[PDB]
Design a binder for this molecule. Structure first.
Ligand code: YCF
Ligand code: YCF
Ligand code: MG
Ligand code: MG
Lengths: 286, 286
């Protein structure tokens, strides 16, 4: 096949940078500026994803630059020159605890911002955390809103306005837990944090007879003492509060951000430095 | 206000026949035929409702004749000259067990047809069961698809295709009960059947200190022996199988249709007679 004419009109396509199950990510150059962009190709919910990407505005969430709906979908985004977090943690590799904290703080700010704006990501994983440079101290941005959920008034809320004369008991039972769907993102963050800190996954079929499903529903992560000995007590404590099986008891992003592990003025200074460094501001009054 | 010009072009509007929270039902005459129709007015999901009504084809489900999207919504439907089931059961009035069986058989055929076609009604109640004539032995049709749900591939199904490395435990737990949303219609049918047979609601705040919610979630309906003494054992048995709190154990429409109470050749003959009577067939080959 060929790239669609409208895309070719504005961009010169280059090398493949990465790939997923749905397609791949290409390097491209915007003709107008001669600057690099990334183009995510999705082989034929993208429409809602685009709507979400256009509305959001946070330094730790990827921005969309362009969109082409042709034989495949083409999403033009800023190029994250550090690539995927996945490549930093694969093969038991492990980030310094300080680096983990810097990245995780930013993931939390991003997810907090999503939840404030009524968006649940639903696919948080190292592949979807992008790094701004090849330097260890860098900005991160969350990507892939392909299976995200937009919160709004539910059918349940409409249901509860009337008298339940004809209403099934399971619907009334569901009221106890409704409105905690956002907690799935906090669980995923917990798994990512566990992986970053230890270089291995908390739940895996590797050298165990307990099924993956049972490990997860029981909350019984694989704790290898020798791997963790070098990690602080505070970091593990936060992991434990995120990997709580009851979604109503699980730490929210706000609670995680208040945790002793993230009360680190050095880390927060580094983040703020990195932010101002990124930005091309233009003159301001006064 | 006035009726929209496009509606006036085709219909002459007459008296109010009934009303709901969302609007009212008017008598109207189609100019082309000089025949009576009903027009449901909904004051400004109707679009999906119309899509559902147009696709369905069953003798016990109302048919749409026309639709106007103006200042309000106008849905033109066949006129059900018997009006709402609600008016037959209000004020402790009660239908003969035989009439209950005839109506309930038809409600079951209609809901069975919905579930086969991947539609959950979600608002079954006596107001939404319409009668074809003022005669006791008549056809019934289900109406109001304003809060119905269309079944299809779920997000959960897509979720289960991958490895749950990052997946929250509540999602895996939800797998045990997923795909039983249709059972809410069977519960509502059970409540309707209870009301038709007894002339009173199974769950109500009337002369009780148990909250409505607790009556329902416990499955503890109000059984007044003296009201029920004249009702058959078989009829009550079916009610009991529909008012089961566990949605996976609850009778389906298929199970209800196989129940001893509905193994009534006289009732089924009456239904078939009523069907052929309704229809204006045109010549057939052979
Ligand atoms: C610098 C670099 N690579 N450098 C290199 N290989 N040098 O040899 C590099 C590598 C990988 C990436 N990734 C990347 O950009 N991901 C990404 C993933 C998903 C989406 C979206 C919106 N998805 N939306 C949907 N619906 N999905 O299904 C967008 C971007 C970026 C830079
Ligand atoms: C013969 C008669 N009345 N005769 C009389 N009063 N004589 O004095 C009579 C009375 C009432 C009715 N009802 C009636 O037709 N209901 C009805 C309810 C709902 C809908 C729908 C599609 N709703 N869709 C939505 N989204 N809703 O929110 C359609 C029809 C019919 C005939
Ligand atoms: Mg994804
Ligand atoms: Mg309704």
């Amino acid at each position: 096949s060929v790239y669609p004419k409208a895309l070719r009109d504005e961009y010169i396509m280059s090398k493949t940078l990465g790939s997923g199950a749905c397609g791949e990510v290409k390097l491209a150059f915007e003709r107008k500026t001669c600057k690099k962009v990334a183009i995510k190709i999705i082989s034929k919910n993208v429409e809602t994803e685009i709507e979400i990407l256009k509305k959001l505005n946070h330094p730790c969430i990827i921005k969309i630059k362009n969109f082409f709906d042709a034989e495949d979908y083409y999403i033009v985004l800023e190029l994250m020159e550090g690539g995927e977090l996945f490549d930093k943690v694969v093969g038991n590799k492990r980030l310094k605890e300080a680096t983990c904290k810097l990245y995780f703080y930013q993931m939390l700010l991003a997810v907090q911002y999503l939840h404030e704006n009524g968006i649940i990501h639903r696919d948080l994983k190292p592949e979807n955390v992008l790094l701004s440079s090849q330097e260890e101290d860098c900005l991160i941005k969350i990507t892939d809103f392909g299976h995200s959920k937009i919160l709004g008034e539910t059918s349940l809320m409409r249901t509860l306005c009337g008298t339940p004369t004809y209403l099934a008991p399971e619907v009334l039972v569901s009221v106890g837990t409704a409105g905690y769907n956002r907690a799935v993102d906090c669980w995923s963050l917990g798994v990512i944090l566990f992986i970053c800190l230890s270089g291995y996954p908390p739940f895996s079929e590797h050298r165990t007879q307990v099924s993956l499903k049972d490990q997860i529903t029981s909350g019984k992560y694989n704790f290898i003492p020798e791997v963790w000995a070098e990690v602080s007590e505070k970091a593990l404590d936060l992991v434990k509060k995120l990997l709580v099986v009851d979604p109503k008891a699980r730490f929210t992003t706000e609670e995680a951000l208040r945790h002793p592990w993230l009360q680190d003025e050095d880390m927060k200074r580094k983040f703020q430095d990195l932010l101002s460094e990124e930005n091309e501001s233009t003159a301001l009054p006064q």
